[PDB]
Amino acid sequence: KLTIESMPLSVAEGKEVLLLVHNLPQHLFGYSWYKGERVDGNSQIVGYVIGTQQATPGAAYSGRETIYTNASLLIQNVTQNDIGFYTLQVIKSDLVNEEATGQFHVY
């Protein structure tokens, strides 16, 4: 069951947070990370194809975000206004796909 863990859960403003991914399913084509709680193209940070290892930024990419090979997302220079919701869509090879949302708390 796919879930997202924040390291750390509470993030000092301007510091960085790692979003770790637990329980990735098998037979994956790639990952997509979104700012906020929903899978929405206008809030996409990155699309990442595993086989090619090609990250392509989406309209929400700000320069702060880095995706890793294990699907983890590092966000640097976290802003005070950030509600902290980030959403991962796992794209399976059969396209019956899964999502999970995590959040951190800025102070």
Distance CA 72, CA 40 (A): 19
CB of 84 to a second copy, least distance (A): 17
Give 69's contacts (C-beta < 8 A, 6+ positions apart).
50, 53
32 binds a second copy (CB under 8 A): no
8 binds a second copy (CB under 8 A): yes
Q: How many CB atoms lie within 10 A of CB 52?
A: 8
Distance CA 102, CA 3 (A): 7
Beta bridge partners of 93: none
> Residue 85: which of 68, 99, 67 has the closest Cα?
99
26 binds a second copy (CB under 8 A): no
CB of 14 to a second copy, least distance (A): 12
2 binds a second copy (CB under 8 A): no
CB of 55 to a second copy, least distance (A): 10
Residues from 37 through 76 that contact a second copy (CB under 8 A)? 66, 68-70, 72, 74, 76
Which residues in this chain contact a second copy in the complex, by CB under 8 A?
Answer: 7-8, 16, 18, 20, 66, 68-70, 72, 74, 76
